[PDB]
Design a protein around this ligand. Sequence first.
Ligand code: COA
Ligand code: COA
Lengths: 405, 406, 408, 405
Amino acid sequence: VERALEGIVVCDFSWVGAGPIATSVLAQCGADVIRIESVKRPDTLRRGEPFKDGIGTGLDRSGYFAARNANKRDIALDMNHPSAREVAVRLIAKSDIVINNFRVGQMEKWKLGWDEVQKINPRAIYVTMSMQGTDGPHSRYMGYGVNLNALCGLTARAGFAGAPPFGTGTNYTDHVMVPTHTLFGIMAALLEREVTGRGQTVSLSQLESAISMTPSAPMAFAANGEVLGPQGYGDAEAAPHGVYTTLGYRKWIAIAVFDDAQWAALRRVMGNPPWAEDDGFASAEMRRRNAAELDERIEAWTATQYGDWLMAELLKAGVPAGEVRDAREAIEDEHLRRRGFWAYLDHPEVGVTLYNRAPIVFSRTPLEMKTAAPSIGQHTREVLGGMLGYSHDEIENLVSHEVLV
Amino acid sequence: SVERALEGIVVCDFSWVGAGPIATSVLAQCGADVIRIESVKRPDTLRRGEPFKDGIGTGLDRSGYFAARNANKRDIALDMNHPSAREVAVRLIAKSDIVINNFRVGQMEKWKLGWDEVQKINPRAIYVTMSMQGTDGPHSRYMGYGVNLNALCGLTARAGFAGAPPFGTGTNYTDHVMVPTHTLFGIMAALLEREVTGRGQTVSLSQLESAISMTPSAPMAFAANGEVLGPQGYGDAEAAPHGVYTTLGYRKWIAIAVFDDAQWAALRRVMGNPPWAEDDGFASAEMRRRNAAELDERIEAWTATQYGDWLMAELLKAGVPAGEVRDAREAIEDEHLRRRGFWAYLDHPEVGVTLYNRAPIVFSRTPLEMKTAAPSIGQHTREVLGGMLGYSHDEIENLVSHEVLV
Amino acid sequence: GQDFSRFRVLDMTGELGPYAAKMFAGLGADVIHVESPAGDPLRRVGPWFGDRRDAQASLQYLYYNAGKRGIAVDLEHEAGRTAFRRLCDGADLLIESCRPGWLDGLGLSYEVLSRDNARLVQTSITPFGRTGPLAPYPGSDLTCSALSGFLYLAGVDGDKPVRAPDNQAYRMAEAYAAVGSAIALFSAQRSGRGQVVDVACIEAQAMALENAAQFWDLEGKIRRGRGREAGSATLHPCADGFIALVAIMGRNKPMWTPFVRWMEAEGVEEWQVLDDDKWIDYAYRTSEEGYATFCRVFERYTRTRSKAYLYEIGQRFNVAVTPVSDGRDLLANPQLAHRGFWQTQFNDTLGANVTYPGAPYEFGEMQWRLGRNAPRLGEHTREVLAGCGYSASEIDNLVREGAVYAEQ
Amino acid sequence: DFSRFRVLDMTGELGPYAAKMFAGLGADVIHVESPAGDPLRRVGPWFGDRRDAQASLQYLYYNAGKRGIAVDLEHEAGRTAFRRLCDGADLLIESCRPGWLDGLGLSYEVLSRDNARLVQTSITPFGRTGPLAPYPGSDLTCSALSGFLYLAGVDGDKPVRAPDNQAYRMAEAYAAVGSAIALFSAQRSGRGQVVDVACIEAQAMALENAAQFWDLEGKIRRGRGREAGSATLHPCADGFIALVAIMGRNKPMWTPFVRWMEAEGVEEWQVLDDDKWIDYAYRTSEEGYATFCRVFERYTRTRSKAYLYEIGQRFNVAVTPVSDGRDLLANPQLAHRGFWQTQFNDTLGANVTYPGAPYEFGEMQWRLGRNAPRLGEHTREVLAGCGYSASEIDNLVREGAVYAE
Ligand SMILES: *SCCNC(=O)CCNC(=O)[C@H](O)C(C)(C)COP(=O)(O)OP(=O)(O)OC[C@H]1O[C@@H](n2cnc3c(N)ncnc32)[C@H](O)[C@@H]1OP(=O)(O)O
Ligand SMILES: *SCCNC(=O)CCNC(=O)[C@H](O)C(C)(C)COP(=O)(O)OP(=O)(O)OC[C@H]1O[C@@H](n2cnc3c(N)ncnc32)[C@H](O)[C@@H]1OP(=O)(O)O
């Protein structure tokens, strides 16, 4: 077993969203991710649904928290304790990456800004994530993923024309846009450190990471002076392109046609009904012009079909199609399971439950899923005595003073 | 017992042509010792620019374009690319309160006289620079003159008749007031600060940003409303009537501006209360705006039968803003500007007595002074070198014999 | 200060793929966009620069392929495949979005491409992956979103879902493919051995189910979108648009009282209805009555006020409020202005300035940059092949047989 | 910084930029209005469709950074309060009609009786003294009488106005300078004085060389715009550009322009490759100017402002766009410099964007300052700051001597 980040150590202050999912990826690559979580301020997700069997007792039953924290170690350091900084310094001295997603200024309250980390460990990569920058009129503002969806322009362009916008239905910004840019910045600094022997700071604006993956709204306005509106489930080029009812409860199929060859294949799957042979649907331009009627006619037909059988037929004919799956269908999907995306891990409290690896299949250094999410302070003594070199007596003293739990 | 507001202030003035010289001219009128550094090999371009005394453009000391920006200054002729010239500038910087230059970026650094160097020569020195639009940025190397800045800052687009090509001011306006006044205020702010801190500091200006700061409506209206605010000729957004109207004589116009119903009643009175003006289509400010086209035509039909100076007098005596549209001769000959002492005539060894003006400030206790016409290149080299900078007669002779100076 | 200039990245991508290589270009890597002679399909989708519809007018193409040079090679031609192999011989990273099996079937498997370049990383970006039951079949942004579970969350109750803008199925895969590439590149620097990096849209989007999978695994519940839990990730209309609100989450109690403070301070009619502990429990917020009078009370007030007002007054009272920004708002955002985010660069092919999103991160030593304007088709074919050791005559003959396409 | 200086600012449509410059460097600036309101509040352009007392964009800009009071100087108790304010002020800037304050018993000698340092700056259309001092002036009529307006045209054409009341702005900028000079002097002498700045004089500072043309050559000049290639304006595809390709006999400036035309393949560019263009008399001749516009505008009419700016400057020619408000907000150089200042306005309930700093200092910091005041917004606290009891203020409010919001 070869691991891409073998030997890497992460001092992980990050919590809630974005930060934790990023360090989860590092841990799947073999990095020793040491999460600092105090009993004084437990990760808010530990108290968030869903819980095993809907029983939200204690702090170790939430799948919201758990899914973001597989394969991590956890030390319960109360960073506001006067004696805590000395423990954190020992860890930073052994860490390749120091990361946090607190509000701006928090690390400096603990005298753990870059200036001090660079002196503790000139090889450390000091990673900070702010909502929208360390400085500026809005730098003290706060928000969750759904807030950044709105501020970055995504939500306005995620909805039906003429209706209230909807967004993604999730805290999307935190799940992919922010952690991926964070991870890339980390890796860039690690690659550079291989040559320079020095760490450096990596600072991300979550707002700017999100806009960087939704460029059309600002670019279209900056270039043409008009706001690019939402388009529901339609497309600007593909035709037909939409979401259509099939048989069953809240059952839809997505169908997307990009050229005349795919339109001919869709017509054949439909049984070549006379209506689809009309000159009003013969070219991509006409199918766009007549999209409303086209969608109505397609839905009249898809509503008589089983969506899985129809999807299989369309894909076999070269037409992009996909059943609109709920989460159970994703969990039970032959494809994701054969790919090994889903992973079940045992947990002393909740038993065997569902996790997933990050979406990368390495041919030589594959991701690994080894341990369920930790409890607060699960590895306090192990880390203090093993990595940080505290004597047995010093650990007992630290615990008596409640520096750690 | 003459009191001068800037008594004892010394200015090391590398600046030339436009904005910089105008600013230091004001300092000189306040009693500052402004020592202009000019090279004979690279004289101020304005010295070769019309107007010239009697239209004779021989030599370098006959231009009114140059002269009017350089009253009351002393002038030493340094070739700053000679190594021995640098040492002279250091001595001057060492005694100067203000160091100013408006070369393109990097020029002072070529001579190792940047702020880093000047602060070590004299921590009390105020180091003044300017650029078209900033020293760094995508357009920082761009070039332009006052007319270019009028256009870039948004002024020219809003200086013209609706539906016609814009005109601007007809001048290099940005350089004449916007830039020099902000330059001067920044200098004075730094001098006020130095009184308490004992240290000089850098003062830097973007000419573009100085200009926009005095033309806020175009950017503010677009930023707030998404509307481009257009030009309005000689009209106004609130006043009505408001415009430029023909009177008797060659290219004769009078400006008239009415801001309320009382001033409109006064204009009607001066016009002799013609029935047309009693219409309710003109009874309110908003109706006079709606009917501005007809109103302007009717006003001009009447003003064109009148002498503008007599009409202006009658309107002002009725409380109506009015003013003949004056050419430069009329401004020079104006009873008011002359009674105010705005214009000043100074004798010059080459062109004789010619017209200058003081800056537009009447100080009740430390009045501006107009004492000497613009200097010739190197007129004061020996006086400054020996008097202020402490060079011996032989060292002076050696500096000038080698062509380092004069 | 340093940069990525030592890394050469071959980027054979189209509508799917190109943001990954842009991330490398943004830190200074030598990135070469590889097109077919028929041209990158991203050139043919909007939005567009003005009324232009030509090969250089796609705003997306300009954005995702800034910072890259451009070549054109026909891999269906044996001499094109020979040149491609010479290119791969000198590359640190190949990113590509080809249909699964195509390169293998052309004799261009990873083992071939790396035979004389053991460190080579090959990253494949595909709808469903290089392997598995769906790998043979076509996918698009919409259909990957459907099959991953992501699309279904963009609605409530029986409503059909809406799409995310800017092909997020593609963008999610590309962002994770950039990460995977960088991880494999780091591993290769240390081990001397590259590998294949397989990133599928369907998997990248399953990363964005939030907690929907855990809701099924742990509670046997099918969830859809947020938007109907009173005061928790809800959207509300105002005078000039919409705002997004997170005034309470989970069973974490600080957050609600400040929201009531705000409503009281503003004199919102019926504010007192909100001063009640019935609002602290996840089951009540999601109840019909809990949600409806939350919106009655709040939206009676928000509907009279602007997005910027609520952003200001909300964050002023410490409530996590943000505006639903449109493109105009984004360009006017004073925080982004303070940060210098918007990048403007004159484009000589268009004869105009183009404004782009800017850096997503900052580094202590490295420098982010937009880089050169996106390439014209085959713009750099000649110089890139010359850089690989091809003579001027060999290039002419490659053009002559149709193995590559150089611009004129 | 300037916080140690107190500035009283009794100005309206004329006057307010001067005190804004002090406010911009941190001075304690108090905008003094009558209970009837600053007339600038009633002038546009406006914030949207609002026409109320806080909606004038000019009022917001020129009086940002100042607090606000309202006093009725027609009242003896209003005059008493004004004198107590002046007792503690370093600078009073005002634009009253000449003679008005003296006639109220508020001459400079009275106002400085117990404050010898006080500087009083008067900003008026024509000055405190002289044959025009009794009479009204406006931006247009001052521009006419100064000689400045006449230059905004050629031949027999009526002139056009400069935007944003440059008669007022020129006086205000020079009055800020005069104020600072007199303030510096007072800091050293212990004695203030009166600073008298007239619009008609400030604008005569802007005649370029028109007065010297008369004095030296007996010539009446009007505007630039008809000397071929020298401060000429030219139509282009989406507006106009301003060009300076030559001045005097400076052939080195012209050659790069000829090369630009050659490189662009401009029809007849060879016409410009001729030393006749070096001759001012030819550039201003009817045929020279007409032929220049013919050749140049064939090219410019086909290209945008942004194109010509870029390419002209690339060839080292002094070309700039005739920028409109949209061009200004989009200018990438101003963006790079962070010039535009956006500040939320609580009375308007919206963000407002303003021009930014006109200069940078090594130690001092420019700032926009607080939002422009509502009428009498700070009357109470400023009067209490002068030693008035709340009971005395009540009586001042009830008798109408002051207005507090
Ligand atoms: S994906 C969207 C998630 N949001 C972001 O990524 C943006 C960056 N961070 C934030 O916006 C804020 O972190 C959020 C999550 C929005 C709100 O968090 P808080 O405002 O409640 O917390 P702060 O970041 O402001 O400060 C941290 C407070 O929590 C205490 N704390 C953290 N860790 C510890 C430990 N190990 N021991 C003791 N205390 C700890 C901190 O002391 C701090 O609490 P205070 O009481 O303010 O000192
Ligand atoms: S108010 C609006 C006017 N616009 C701007 O101020 C913005 C800048 N734009 C311009 O157009 C230039 O400032 C103009 C007005 C064209 C001046 O052009 P120059 O090229 O002549 O001036 P530079 O600063 O760019 O270079 C200075 C050159 O002159 C020589 N020099 C000056 N003084 C001396 C002395 N005392 N001794 C010797 N040489 C001197 C400098 O050496 C230099 O010549 P180079 O050829 O550049 O070496």
